[PDB]
Amino acid sequence: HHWGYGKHNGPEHWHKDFPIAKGERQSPVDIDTHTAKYDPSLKPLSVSYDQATSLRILNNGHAFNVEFDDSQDKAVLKGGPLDGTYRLIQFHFHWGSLDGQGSEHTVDKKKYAAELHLVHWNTKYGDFGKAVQQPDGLAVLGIFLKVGSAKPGLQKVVDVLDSIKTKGKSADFTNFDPRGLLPESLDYWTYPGSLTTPPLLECVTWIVLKEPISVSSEQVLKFRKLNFNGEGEPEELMVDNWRPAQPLKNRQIKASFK
Numbered sequence: 001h002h003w004g005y006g007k008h009n010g011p012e013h014w015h016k017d018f019p020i021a022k023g024e025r026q027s028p029v030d031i032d033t034h035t036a037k038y039d040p041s042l043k044p045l046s047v048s049y050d051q052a053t054s055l056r057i058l059n060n061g062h063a064f065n066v067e068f069d070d071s072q073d074k075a076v077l078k079g080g081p082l083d084g085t086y087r088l089i090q091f092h093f094h095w096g097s098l099d100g101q102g103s104e105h106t107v108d109k110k111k112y113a114a115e116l117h118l119v120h121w122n123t124k125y126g127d128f129g130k131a132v133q134q135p136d137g138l139a140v141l142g143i144f145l146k147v148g149s150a151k152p153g154l155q156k157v158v159d160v161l162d163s164i165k166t167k168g169k170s171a172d173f174t175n176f177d178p179r180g181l182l183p184e185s186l187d188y189w190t191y192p193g194s195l196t197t198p199p200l201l202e203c204v205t206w207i208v209l210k211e212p213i214s215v216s217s218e219q220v221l222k223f224r225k226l227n228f229n230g231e232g233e234p235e236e237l238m239v240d241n242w243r244p245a246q247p248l249k250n251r252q253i254k255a256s257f258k
């Protein structure tokens, strides 16, 4: 047994094993659109996923991760609020049991049906494990999912979920293009924060896109068929795997747009 999202091991318990849960720069947060300062010094985000190499998809018991080859500068995030270059290592999502909840960040208290996280690590620290020990170690791009028209570029991900239903299952997952998960606009808010699962390390520059992607009800339904438990255990549907908003405290949310 370990941390999870249930009544006995969920977000409100995490602090007992990861005391930084109560720290000064925790994620997610509510993005108050009227308090976020437009910052004309922010650069456009640079997302270069042209040469991205997906390798595998994994159910790790808390979400599913699509993993990338990060042994070269093939899929990088640069510009925006960032200095230097961050390599894509994985993406995953957080979603709800119902369309009314599921996102981690909220926007003037609005919850989206899900949220995508494309996780990148600062190439000056050499590997992901070293980056997470650093205040500017990670750059996570957050994208909101709302339910409406399907996202054609998500379908390949939903169709493989049958094969990784339970914890520890993985499947080959090559030639997936993450550029088909982006919305049209790259307007963003940014603030310094943390991993939103344990160990909750305060290593993240969060870059959250203003424009949501639209996904179909059937697509998000297929997320909710996955399982937190392993094969041949009591079936526990993988839903509501989001941490609620944490105290903003001494932080400013900047906007890249007016």
Ligand SMILES: NS(=O)(=O)c1nccs1
Binding pocket: 001, 002, 003, 004, 008, 009, 010, 013, 014, 015, 016, 017, 018
């Ligand atoms: N702090 S924790 O979420 O890992 C936890 N372990 C057992 C019950 S709650």
Ligand SMILES: NS(=O)(=O)c1nccs1
Binding pocket: 117, 119, 140, 194, 195, 196, 197, 198, 199
């Ligand atoms: N949910 S997240 O992107 O902040 C993340 N947490 C741990 C590894 S990646």
Ligand SMILES: [Zn+2]
Binding pocket: 092, 093, 094, 117, 196
């Ligand atoms: Zn996440």
